[model samples]
Target chain A: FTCPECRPELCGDPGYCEYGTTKDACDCCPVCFQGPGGYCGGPEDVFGICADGFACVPVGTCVKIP
Target chain B: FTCPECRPELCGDPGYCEYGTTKDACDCCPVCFQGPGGYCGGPEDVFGICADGFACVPLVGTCVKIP
Candidate 1:
């Protein structure tokens, strides 16, 4: 119901968005916008920079670039 | 947005409903309506009939056959 579910949005809406996304966990979407980072943490998890020069801003600051 | 998704109603709505459902993979949903069939085919994919004798009915023709 929100943006880029395939590309998830974590970290904001603490009370509402608190499920699934822990400090080290990820949301329940296919492609985690949290990062190209494969998993929440651990070795496989790697942060992929947004190709369009989009820094991985925290939850409240993720602006949808037009 | 639809029904029986976690339980999947395949074989109908073939027009706007064409995609994935390939002979292999499944939908993006965590719990596919397609079934407990883990994957789509050739392996873990197993069809769990609608517990209440629901006969895994076709997309449209499947009745909610009440006991």
Candidate 2:
């Protein structure tokens, strides 16, 4: 499955995106770092997890959506 | 002349919305504020409330959307 994309406003740097991880580490995408719980077709179906205050909204919700 | 609009952010100091009695006040939708909890149309039509990250989409995802 595909997770909703969002703005670059992640935990660490804007350029560094680590989706669905507890520590907010694991830079993945050039614009979307891999958090902690992301599922790369790994053991789990879906594993990508947002950090603490972060919630995953529709891809458009995070950015200007244009 | 309707919604499907979005530009500025709100809630408290940004403008002055009080609709939900929440601090993220509404100046009342000026540039989309009037801020706070006092929408018009006489008393109310649709009480606005967004002082936390807003999410009102529908305008036009492209600057190229023809008029």
Candidate 3:
């Protein structure tokens, strides 16, 4: 998809993510992942991932296991 | 909320979730979790969870991490 050139400086602190962080969709930046009550899921490249035992809801936000 | 008595028999094989399974909100049933490309969330007692390294998107699909 012709990913734009990655600029490490453009990225900033991922905040306090309990489960840690992961690469963005473009694989360019490191963003914090969401946990039990964290927010998630979007079409943008800056989307956050849900931690284990949790999943991002279709309508929006993170949901617990099952 | 009052969680109904869990019925082990009502639970099924869970399907092909690569990551694993987890309890429903009521903790009544064990449902398979979704990995990359898997489906999740609904706001019902039967919503699904995403596996490690993946997150359920608002559009109803899973997105993955490079690592």
Candidate 4:
């Protein structure tokens, strides 16, 4: 059975789930959040945040620094 | 020589130029804009609008249909 939160069928590909849903209920990728640095994952995956000292400011793009 | 519009050094990577700068004055990527759909490029590129058939509605990224 599929998780109710996920609408993978919608995007013609596996889709993201509700923010707090269990991982098992989701699909191939984890739910990423927008952080200070950048998105949670790379460009190809669901968008989210980066870690401290970084930024998702450019929005979706990632630019890691030391 | 570098284009003033591009700040490739800022991101520590080749950065995008001002929206209206000439291509020669920019870097590898073109300036994308937000449209009715989603963003212009994929998640990795600068945030902008997707094509007419797609929607970047989720905000951050993703090319999907409008809900």
Candidate 5:
């Protein structure tokens, strides 16, 4: 696959990702974090992730924290 | 890539995944999930998967759930 270029400007209002921004799958541009159970585990996300008080338990499922 | 023998029992630990088990890059052997902020991504989806409420942030290089 052709690794794309990064675009820091693509970043928007967001959090859970420390600086509120992160690299895309291609590691080319800044990408936003997924919301609660927002269909993670994809190529974009690489697998799965969640925000505060949540964690990807199984098969990239976003569940609440205890 | 060639697959392997999927062993559901091998994944008995606390998986970061919802089903407590994820498939390997070959999509054969069962792999465990990662917790929040866990690093992910690789040639395939081998790095690892995230659990509930969490998503792999390629830029972050870890599982970072959206808020």
Candidate 6:
């Protein structure tokens, strides 16, 4: 499902569009996995959680598996 | 231009992949322009500031200037 604001050039053909927040709020950035919890409003919210042994960092990058 | 974690199927072909944070950290997602400050980790870091008269939204797997 392509996001409402998704641009084919950036979000690919279709369905690649994903967001950490609402479509109206968050842009269409491809996501491998939707981070734990819901859309975060700040770095603290992202960095604050440790899900599946992976730490959320840099917006929504799930790394630090240790 | 291509970013790490950038699956061509998702991030498109070479050079299309981009990152909001470090390549080793941020995933490739495609970005029109890098947002103000630096890589963002959440909606707040994105929505918090508006750059070039545009709001920084989720882009390159993070936040970037509105496309």
TM-score of each: 0.15, 0.16, 0.39, 0.21, 0.35, 0.21
Question: Which of the predicted structures, 1 or 4, would earn the higher DockQ when compared with the native?
Answer: 4
State the lDDT of candidate 3 residue by residue for A1-66, as single tens digits: 234444464432344545766775556546556655543443341223676677876424467887
Off by over 4 Å in 2: A1-13, A17-30, A33-37, A40-66, B1-53, B60-67
Off by over 4 Å in 1: A1-66, B1-48, B60-63
Put down candidate 2 lDDT per residue, B16-65, tens digits, no spaces.
Answer: 22322332122223312222222211112122223333322222110111
Residue B66, candidate 1: alpha-carbon lDDT: 48
Per-residue CA lDDT of model 1 for A1-66, tens digit only, reads: 121222124211222221123332223322223322111211112221122323333311223355
Which stretches of model 4 miss by more than 4 angstroms?
A1-6, A11-48, A52-66, B1-6, B10-48, B52-67
C-alpha positional error of residue A56 in candidate 2 after TM-score superposition, expressed in Å: 19
lDDT for A37 in candidate 2 is: 25
Across A1-66, the per-residue lDDT of candidate 6 in tens digits comes to: 222344424432112323222222345433332344322222333212233555555433445455
Query: Candidate 4's residue-wise lDDT over B7-64, tens digit each?
Result: 4322221123222221211343232333343233333433334544556644345555
**Model 5: per-residue Cα lDDT over B1-67, one tens digit each:** 3332444433222223342466656463455566565555555654456666778777534577788
Give the lowest summed-lDDT range of ten residues in model 6 chain B: B12-21
What lDDT is reached at residue B47 by model 1? 21
Q: Order the candidate numbers by lDDT, best to worst.
A: 3, 5, 4, 6, 2, 1
What docking grade does candidate 6 earn? incorrect
Share of reference contacts found in each model? 0.00, 0.00, 0.00, 0.09, 0.03, 0.06
Chain B of candidate 2 vs. true chain B, TM: 0.16
Quantify all predictions' global Cα lDDT against the true fold.
0.23, 0.24, 0.49, 0.34, 0.49, 0.33
Model with the higher DockQ, candidate 3 or 5: 5
Output the worst ten-in-a-row residue range by lDDT, candidate 3 chain B.
B38-47
Q: Please write out the lDDT profile of model 2 over residues A1-66, one tens digit for every residue.
A: 222332243211222233322221122212232233221111111112334444433211221112
What is the docking quality class of candidate 1? incorrect
Better model by DockQ: candidate 3 vs candidate 4:
4
